Design an enzyme around this catalytic site. Structure first.
Site: not given
Ligand SMILES: C[N+](C)(C)CCSSc1ccc([N+](=O)[O-])c(C(=O)O)c1
Ligand SMILES: *[C@@H]1O[C@H](CO[C@@H]2O[C@@H](C)[C@@H](O)[C@@H](O)[C@@H]2O)[C@@H](O[C@@H]2O[C@H](CO)[C@@H](O)[C@H](O)[C@H]2NC(C)=O)[C@H](O)[C@H]1NC(C)=O
Ligand SMILES: *[C@@H]1O[C@H](CO[C@@H]2O[C@@H](C)[C@@H](O)[C@@H](O)[C@@H]2O)[C@@H](O[C@@H]2O[C@H](CO)[C@@H](O)[C@H](O)[C@H]2NC(C)=O)[C@H](O)[C@H]1NC(C)=O
Ligand SMILES: *[C@@H]1O[C@H](CO[C@@H]2O[C@@H](C)[C@@H](O)[C@@H](O)[C@@H]2O)[C@@H](O[C@@H]2O[C@H](CO)[C@@H](O)[C@H](O)[C@H]2NC(C)=O)[C@H](O)[C@H]1NC(C)=O
Ligand SMILES: *[C@@H]1O[C@H](CO[C@@H]2O[C@@H](C)[C@@H](O)[C@@H](O)[C@@H]2O)[C@@H](O)[C@H](O)[C@H]1NC(C)=O
Ligand SMILES: C[N+](C)(C)CCSSc1ccc([N+](=O)[O-])c(C(=O)O)c1
Ligand SMILES: *[C@@H]1O[C@H](CO)[C@@H](O)[C@H](O)[C@H]1NC(C)=O
Ligand SMILES: *[C@@H]1O[C@H](CO)[C@@H](O)[C@H](O)[C@H]1NC(C)=O
Ligand code: NA
Length: 527
Positions: A323, A196, A114-115, A436, A80
Site C-alpha cells: 500500500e 481508497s 483519489g483522496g 496501492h 489516474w
Molecule cells: C500523491 N498522489 C498524487 C498520488 C495522491 C493522489 S490525490 S491526494 C491523496 C491523499 C491521500 C490518499 N489516501 O489514500 O490516503 C489518496 C488516495 O490514493 O486515495 C490521495
C-alpha cells in the site's frame, strides 16, 4: 436503439460488443441540479424533469480538481488523472447493463478514490462493461465533488455544511433506488464498492442513517473511515475554511458573507489555494474531506463504530501488500521511480519527518524503533522497505484490519483479503511491489481482455476475483464454488483469518500484520 424511461425523463444508451456479446452503456446521466452559482458548496438539489431524450452517449464532465503533474508523460501517474473535461457541472453517473436487459440483476455501485481531492468515474480502470458482460450484474458509477468544492465546512452552516461530496454519492444511490428497475436492476440487491477514499466513503455510508436503506452490502478495497487521512475534526475543518478565505481575500466577520465571497471566486483560485490551508502537509494530505457535520455524520465515527451504531450487513474488506510505496516518490528523500531507491538510515529518518510532520521526536523515534530491528542489518534495502511498510501499515492496512475487527464484533459476517499480485503491465518500478490502487483493474476484469497483454495466469486470477466479488454482491458469500477454489472463511476477531489473492497459491492465513498493528492501533494514537 435502446431507450429507457426514467422518473426524470427518457435516456438513450449505446451498444458495446464485449467478448462476443452485448452490453448497453448509459454514460453521463445527470442525477442532480448542477451545483453552480449560488449552489456552490451546498448539498445537491434534486433534478428537475426533462421531456427530451437525454443522450447518455459519452462520459460526462469530471468535477473540478487539481491534477498530479509530478511525472508528465508517465502512464503510471497519468492513468489516474481525469480523462474528461473539468467542470463544476459534473454530477452525473453511468450505468452498464447486460444485453438482453436483465430481469432482476444485482447492482454494483462504484465509488472512486483519489483522496477526496481527485478522481473521476470515467477512468479506464473503472469501466464496468466487463462485469456487466461476464457476471450479468449492473454496474453504476458516479462523479461526486472533491476538494474544497466537495468538503468545505463551516459547522451547521447550510451555505457550506461540509460532506457535500458524500451527499453527492448519497443522491446517486437514491437515484438507483428510484430508477434502476427500469434498467432491469434489483433495488433490493445493491452492493457498494470503492477503493481508497472510495472505500472510506463506503464505510461512512454504513454509518450514515440516510444511507441505510439505499444499499444492501459493502466492499472496501484499501480504505476505511478510521484511516488517519479519512476524517477531519470540526476544529481543523473550520480552521481550513478560514485559511482558504484569507488566501482568496474573503475574510469577513459574518461567516455567511465569507461563503458568498467564496462563491464569486473562480474555481482555479480556490484550487490553487487548497494546498496551503495547512501549515505542513504530506503526500497523503486530505485538506478537505469528511467531517462530523451533524447531518451525514451524527456523531464522531470512531464512537459509532465502537458502540455498534451502523448498518448490520456483510462486508468484504482488503488491502494490497505494498500500500505505502506509491507515496514515497512524492516527497521522501532518496526515492525515485527511476532507480532502486536504496536509502540510508539518515534518509529514512528524514522520510518520517516528511510523513509525520506534526509528531514529536519521541513519536518519530518510536516508529524507527519498531521498524528497524533487522533480520539482517546488512541488507541494503532494509530502510527502503521499512518506510514503505510504515506508510502502508499506518495509512491503510492497520485501519482496515481494525475496522473489520470492530464491525465483525457485532455479529455480521466479514471477509478479508490480502492482494499480493503485481500486475505484469504495471508501469512503476519493481521495488514498489504490489502498489496501492493496482488491484482495481483485476476487480474490473480488464485482464479478461486477451488483447491487452496480461498473462494467462492474470486472466485466471481476475476471473476468480470477479466471480468472488459478484457472489459476494448477489449472495453475501465471496466463494468461487465451481473450480475447486479455496473457501474464503469469515473474519472473526478471535482467529482473524484472511485469504491471500495471487496467481500462484490462494491461501488461508491468520492475524495479518499482527505486531505492526498493535503498535499503530494501541501505542501510536497516544503519542
Ligand atoms: C500523491 N498522489 C498524487 C498520488 C495522491 C493522489 S490525490 S491526494 C491523496 C491523499 C491521500 C490518499 N489516501 O489514500 O490516503 C489518496 C488516495 O490514493 O486515495 C490521495
Ligand atoms: C426482484 O427481487 C426481489 C427480491 O430480491 C431478493 O431479496 C432481497 C431482500 C435481497 O436479499 C436480494 O439480494 C435478493 O435478490 C423481489 O422483491 C420482492 O418484492 C415484493 C414486493 O416488493 C415483496 O413483497 C417481497 O418480500 C420481495 N422479496 C424479498 C424482499 O425477498 C422483487 O419482486 C423482484 N422483482 C422482479 C421484477 O423480478
Ligand atoms: C489554524 O490556522 C492558522 C493560520 O494559518 C496560517 O494562515 C493560513 C492562511 C495558511 O497560510 C497557513 O499555513 C498559515 O500558517 C495555522 O497556522 C499558524 O498561523 C498563525 C497565524 O498566522 C502563525 O502564528 C503560525 O506561523 C502558523 N503556523 C503554525 C504551525 O501554527 C494554525 O496552525 C492552524 N491550526 C492548526 C492546529 O494547524
Ligand atoms: C535515486 O534518484 C534520486 C532522485 O534524484 C533524481 O533522479 C535520479 C535518478 C537522477 O536523475 C538525479 O539527477 C535526479 O535528481 C536520488 O536522490 C538525489 O540524490 C542526489 C545525489 O547527488 C542528491 O543531491 C539529491 O538531493 C537527491 N534527491 C532527492 C533526495 O530528492 C538518489 O540518490 C538516487 N538513488 C540511487 C540509489 O540511484
Ligand atoms: C441525440 O441523439 C439523436 C440520435 O442520433 C444518435 O446520435 C448521433 C450522434 C448518431 O450516432 C446517430 O446514429 C444516433 O442515432 C440525435 O438526432 C440528436 O440530435 C442527439 N442530440 C444531441 C446530440 O444533442
Ligand atoms: C460552534 N458550535 C460549538 C456550536 C458547533 C456546533 S455546529 S455542527 C454539529 C456537529 C456534530 C453534531 N453531532 O451530531 O453531535 C451536531 C448536532 O447534532 O448538534 C452539530
Ligand atoms: C450574516 O449575513 C447574512 C446575509 O444575508 C444575514 O442573513 C445574517 O443574518 C447575518 N448573520 C449574522 C450572524 O450576522
Ligand atoms: C473455471 O474453469 C474453467 C475450465 O474448466 C474455466 O474456463 C473458467 O474460466 C473457470 N471459471 C472461474 C469462475 O474461475
Ligand atoms: Na486463482
Amino acid at each position: 436503439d435502446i431507450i429507457i424511461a426514467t422518473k426524470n425523463g427518457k435516456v438513450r444508451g449505446m451498444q458495446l460488443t464485449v467478448f462476443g456479446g452485448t452490453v448497453t452503456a448509459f454514460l453521463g446521466i445527470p442525477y442532480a441540479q448542477p451545483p453552480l452559482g449560488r449552489l456552490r458548496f451546498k448539498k445537491p438539489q434534486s433534478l428537475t424533469k426533462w421531456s427530451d431524450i437525454w443522450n447518455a452517449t459519452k462520459y460526462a464532465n469530471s468535477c473540478c480538481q487539481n491534477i498530479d503533474q509530478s511525472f508528465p508523460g508517465f502512464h503510471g501517474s497519468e492513468m489516474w488523472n481525469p480523462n474528461t473535461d473539468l467542470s463544476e457541472d459534473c454530477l452525473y453517473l453511468n450505468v452498464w447493463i447486460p444485453a438482453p436487459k436483465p430481469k432482476n440483476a444485482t447492482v454494483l455501485i462504484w465509488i472512486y478514490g483519489g483522496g477526496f481531492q481527485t478522481g473521476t468515474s470515467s477512468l479506464h480502470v473503472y469501466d464496468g462493461k466487463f462485469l456487466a458482460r461476464v457476471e450479468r450484474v449492473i454496474v453504476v458509477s458516479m462523479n461526486y465533488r472533491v476538494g474544497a468544492l466537495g468538503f468545505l465546512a463551516l459547522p451547521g452552516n447550510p451555505e457550506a455544511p461540509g460532506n457535500m461530496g458524500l451527499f453527492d454519492q448519497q443522491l446517486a444511490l437514491q437515484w438507483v433506488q428510484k430508477n434502476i428497475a427500469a434498467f432491469g436492476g434489483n433495488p433490493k440487491s445493491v452492493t457498494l464498492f470503492g477503493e481508497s477514499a472510495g472505500a472510506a466513503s463506503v464505510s461512512l455510508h454504513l454509518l450514515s442513517p440516510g444511507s441505510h436503506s439505499l444499499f444492501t452490502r459493502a466492499i472496501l478495497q484499501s480504505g476505511s473511515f478510521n484511516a488517519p487521512w479519512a476524517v477531519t475534526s470540526l476544529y481543523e475543518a473550520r480552521n481550513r475554511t478560514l485559511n482558504l478565505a484569507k488566501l482568496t481575500g474573503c475574510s469577513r466577520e459574518n461567516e455567511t458573507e465569507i461563503i458568498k465571497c467564496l462563491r464569486n471566486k473562480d474555481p482555479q483560485e480556490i484550487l490553487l489555494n487548497e494546498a496551503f490551508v495547512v501549515p505542513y502537509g504530506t503526500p497523503l494530505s486530505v485538506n478537505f474531506g469528511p467531517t462530523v457535520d451533524g447531518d451525514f455524520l451524527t456523531d464522531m465515527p470512531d464512537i459509532l463504530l465502537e458502540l455498534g451504531q451502523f448498518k448490520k450487513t456483510q462486508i468484504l474488506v482488503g488491502v494490497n501488500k505494498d500500500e505505502g510505496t506509491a507515496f514515497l516518490v512524492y516527497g521522501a528523500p532518496g526515492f525515485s521511480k527511476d532507480n532502486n531507491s536504496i536509502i540510508t538510515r539518515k534518509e529514512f529518518q528524514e522520510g518520517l519527518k516528511i510523513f509525520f510532520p506534526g509528531v514529536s521526536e519521541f513519536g518519530k523515534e518510536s516508529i524507527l524503533f519498531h521498524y528497524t530491528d533487522w533480520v539482517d542489518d546488512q541488507r541494503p534495502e532494509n530502510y527502503r522497505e521499512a518506510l514503505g511498510d510504515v506508510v502502508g501499515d499506518y495509512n491503510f492496512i492497520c485501519p482496515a484490519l481494525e475496522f473489520t475487527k470492530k464491525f465483525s464484533e457485532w455479529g455480521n459476517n466479514a471477509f478479508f483479503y490480502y492482494f499480493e499480485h503485481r500486475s505484469s503491465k504495471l508501469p512503476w518500478p519493481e521495488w514498489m511491489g504490489v502498489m496501492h490502487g493496482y488491484e482495481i483493474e483485476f476487480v474490473f476484469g480488464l485482464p479478461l481482455e486477451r488483447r491487452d497483454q496480461y498473462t494467462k495466469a492474470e486472466e485466471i486470477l481476475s476471473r476468480s476475483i470477479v466471480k468472488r466479488w459478484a457472489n459476494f454482491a448477489k449472495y453475501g458469500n465471496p466463494q468461487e464454488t465451481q473450480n475447486q477454489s479455496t473457501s474464503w472463511p469469515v473474519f472473526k476477531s478471535t482467529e482473524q483469518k484472511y485469504l491471500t489473492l495471487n496467481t500462484e497459491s490462494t491461501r488461508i492465513m491468520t492475524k495479518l500484520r499482527a505486531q505492526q498493528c498493535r503498535f499503530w492501533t494501541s501505542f501510536f494514537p497516544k503519542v
